[PDB]
Every structure is written in structure tokens, then in C-alpha cells.
Amino acid sequence: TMCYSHTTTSRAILTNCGENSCYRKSRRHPPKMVLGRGCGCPPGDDNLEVKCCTSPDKCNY
Amino acid sequence: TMCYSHTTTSRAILTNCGENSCYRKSRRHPPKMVLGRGCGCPPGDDNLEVKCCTSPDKCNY
């Protein structure tokens, strides 16, 4: 899948993740904002929601 | 000054910073979002803008 990718400070770029999923990592507590996007599907926890998707392209918007 | 305060994952709380300023730390590159708020006035750089203020209360919104 094609996915957006950035850390909390890096420029957002497009990345071909191939056969991995895309993820979108957001904070759960207000103010709710996306902290990171990339390839794979890392674990969320009490403060962080991690959405993982494989379709469409750029699904981790 | 009274200031908002949170890290990238912590719950936002109100904090009496006393005689320090408030800061608001934002990313410069899209998507532009606030990564952190607190007491003091840490340095920004190429990826991070840091606004520092002393008035009004909660100025680092």
C-alpha cells in the first residue's frame, strides 16, 4: 500500500509500504492530533490510538 | 502566568508557571500541529516553532 509517512517532526512524504499496512498514530486525550504515520502497525495504549489499514492507498490519512 | 501543559501524549492540564512564560511548540512542516505546551521557553529549530508568551493567562493556546 502507498501510505503517508512522518514522525512528530519530519516532513510528510509518500512511502510505498509494499505488503505492510499503513498506520496513523493519534493521541486519545484532547487535543486529539496525529503524532505519526508510516508503514506497519505499531501498538496503541492508553494515550495513543493506532489505526492500521491496507486499502485504499493513503488510507492512513 | 497560567498556562496549558501537556507533552505529545499526556493529558492537557492547567499549570501555574509563576514567573516563567508559557510555550507552545508546533511543527513547522505540514501537517502543522501543536506537539507540546508548558512552562518556560524552549528553543525551536528547523522543524519546530516555539511561541513563548507571558500574558494573558492561557496565552499558549
UniProtKB/Swiss-Prot annotation, chains A, B:
State where the protein is found: Secreted
Origin superkingdom: Eukaryota
Effect listed in the UniProt record for changing K32G: 3-fold decrease in inhibition potency
Q: List the disulfide bonds.
A: C3-C22, C17-C39, C41-C52, C53-C59
In the record, the effect of D45K is given as: No significant difference in inhibition potency
Task: Give the UniProt entry's GO cellular component terms.
Answer: extracellular region
Expression sites by tissue: Expressed by the venom gland.
Q: Does the keyword Ribonucleoprotein apply?
A: no
Keyword set, alphabetical order: Disulfide bond, Secreted, Toxin
Where exactly is the site Blocks the entrance of the active site gorge of hAChE?
Answer: M33
Q: What is the effect of changing R27W?
A: 49-fold decrease in inhibition potency
Result when mutating M33A? 8-fold decrease in inhibition potency
| Known outcome of mutating T9N | 9.0-fold decrease in affinity for TcAChE. 2.1-fold decrease in affinity for TcAChE. 1.9-fold increase in affinity for TcAChE. 3.9-fold decrease in affinity for TcAChE
GO MF assignments: toxin activity
Which family would the database say this protein is a member of? Answer: Belongs to the three-finger toxin family. Short-chain subfamily. Acn-esterase inhibitor sub-subfamily.
**Record function comment:** Interferes with neuromuscular transmission by inhibiting the enzyme acetylcholinesterase (AChE) present at the neuromuscular junction. It selectively binds and inhibits with a 1:1 stoichiometry the mammalian and electric fish AChE at picomolar concentrations. It is highly specific for the peripheral site of AChE and blocks the entry of acetylcholine into the active site of the enzyme (through the Met-33 residue), thereby preventing its breakdown. It has been called fasciculin since after injection into mice it causes severe, generalized and long-lasting (5-7 hours) fasciculations.
What is the name of the protein in this document? Fasciculin-2
